[PDB]
Amino acid sequence: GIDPFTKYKVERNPPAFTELQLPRYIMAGFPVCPKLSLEFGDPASSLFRWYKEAKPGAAEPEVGVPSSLSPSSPSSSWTETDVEERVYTPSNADIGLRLKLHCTPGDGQRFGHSRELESVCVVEAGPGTCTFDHRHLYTKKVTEDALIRTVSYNILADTYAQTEFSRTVLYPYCAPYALELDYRQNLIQKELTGYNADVICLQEVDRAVFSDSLVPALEAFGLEGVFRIKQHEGLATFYRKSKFSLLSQHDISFYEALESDPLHKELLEKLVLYPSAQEKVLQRSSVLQVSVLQSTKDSSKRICVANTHLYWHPKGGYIRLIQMAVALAHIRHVSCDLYPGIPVIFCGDFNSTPSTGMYHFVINGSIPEDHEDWASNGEEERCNMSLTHFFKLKSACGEPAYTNYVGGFHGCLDYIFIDLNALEVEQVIPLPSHEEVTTHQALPSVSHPSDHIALVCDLKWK
Numbered sequence: 001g002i003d004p005f006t007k008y009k010v011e012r013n014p015p016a017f018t019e020l021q022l023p024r025y026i027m028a029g030f031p032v033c034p035k036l037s038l039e040f041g042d043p044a045s046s047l048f049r050w051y052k053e054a055k056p057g058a059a060e061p062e063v064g065v066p067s068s069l070s071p072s073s074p075s076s077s078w079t080e081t082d083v084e085e086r087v088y089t090p091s092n093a094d095i096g097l098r099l100k101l102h103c104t105p106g107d108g109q110r111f112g113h114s115r116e117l118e119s120v121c122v123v124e125a126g127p128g129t130c131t132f133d134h135r136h137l138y139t140k141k142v143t144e145d146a147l148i149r150t151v152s153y154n155i156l157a158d159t160y161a162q163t164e165f166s167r168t169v170l171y172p173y174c175a176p177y178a179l180e181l182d183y184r185q186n187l188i189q190k191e192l193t194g195y196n197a198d199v200i201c202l203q204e205v206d207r208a209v210f211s212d213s214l215v216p217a218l219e220a221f222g223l224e225g226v227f228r229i230k231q232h233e234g235l236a237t238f239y240r241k242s243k244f245s246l247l248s249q250h251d252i253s254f255y256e257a258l259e260s261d262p263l264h265k266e267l268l269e270k271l272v273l274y275p276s277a278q279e280k281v282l283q284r285s286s287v288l289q290v291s292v293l294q295s296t297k298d299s300s301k302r303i304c305v306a307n308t309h310l311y312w313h314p315k316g317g318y319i320r321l322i323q324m325a326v327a328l329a330h331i332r333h334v335s336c337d338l339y340p341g342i343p344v345i346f347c348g349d350f351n352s353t354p355s356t357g358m359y360h361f362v363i364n365g366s367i368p369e370d371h372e373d374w375a376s377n378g379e380e381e382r383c384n385m386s387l388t389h390f391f392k393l394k395s396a397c398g399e400p401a402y403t404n405y406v407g408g409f410h411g412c413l414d415y416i417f418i419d420l421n422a423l424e425v426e427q428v429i430p431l432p433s434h435e436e437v438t439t440h441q442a443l444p445s446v447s448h449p450s451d452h453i454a455l456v457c458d459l460k461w462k
């Protein structure tokens, strides 16, 4: 009815849902993570109730009649479930059924008007096994305050997969349905949420994947994220709110920093002696995400979390060297100048195996001017120089046989680098066995949602 006090009153914007979406793909044993954009409220104080179709086909959609959210069907075609949580995980018994979510926005003090929506898909059977199933045995609980469970994962961008070409030439061994973004995202949501991690650094994140898949899944499990585009896709970093808050951000673009920031003046002076190499470096659009996190448990503890995806080309060794030199100089500035020497975690797809110049530089703190990678793409783009950096770094998950495994290539390209003076490794969550990885020849597969393998480790302060 009419509120008779509105003439006397300036009144609140009530809690209200401003996006409500269900996944377009749903599978038994995989969490259904609704997208909720909640204004003037929070999901934690909101109400959720899940319904399932009474039996397959029972809920016939109203023809031509509009809803702004979903199809609409008779209320009597639906059965109320047990589940009053934001996330619903279907069972085998749900196979063949559509789902319906009824939710009421709240802010802890009051509720706003409820909305409801139905899935357009039915629950499907899930894969028999996934490579992360055994790994999840190690990550059943959120870690204690003394630990930082850290993930690094290149999740394979739809913008590079989705293709018929990618399907027929790069990934011909993979079931086409398992290459589909919606299938891979459902696996990725289960994978990442099951790691129960504190810091998650991702690469090859499509913008829409960030907004529609990762944020809804990970925020349901207590993590918040930030995104930085490269060109067609980019980087994401998530952190567990119960253990960290985001204190500051210091993202850079390597070409932009190298040419315009006096921090890198000495490196730039070395490179201008090599016009052709310099041109190739400054044409690259790789970026570096840097997030300084404040511990919610200990006011004295802050950590510098960096994330990157370096230049991809096999002959791009000298470019990756220069990109990492810029990254580490920038990270030194943030972690040692803007903050007085805080620990560094540096995740990424570095597109560099352990035998490369870039890797040598990282773990030794220097590289000589005569290293062969200074002519990785031939004489004209040669750029011999000696570099040094400040850090004592080690790879927390070591040097696996590979972290990227496709039909035509495999190698260790991904690392979680840590400041070994400040952090140590409590445990490494084992990568899938070679026999697991090759069950469907290579990756991705019906059982594994990327062509890379997630690195997961538990770190501790020294």
Ligand SMILES: [Mg+2]
Pocket: 154, 156, 157, 160, 204
């Ligand atoms: Mg890739």
Ligand SMILES: [Mg+2]
Pocket: 312, 349, 351, 413
């Ligand atoms: Mg790569």
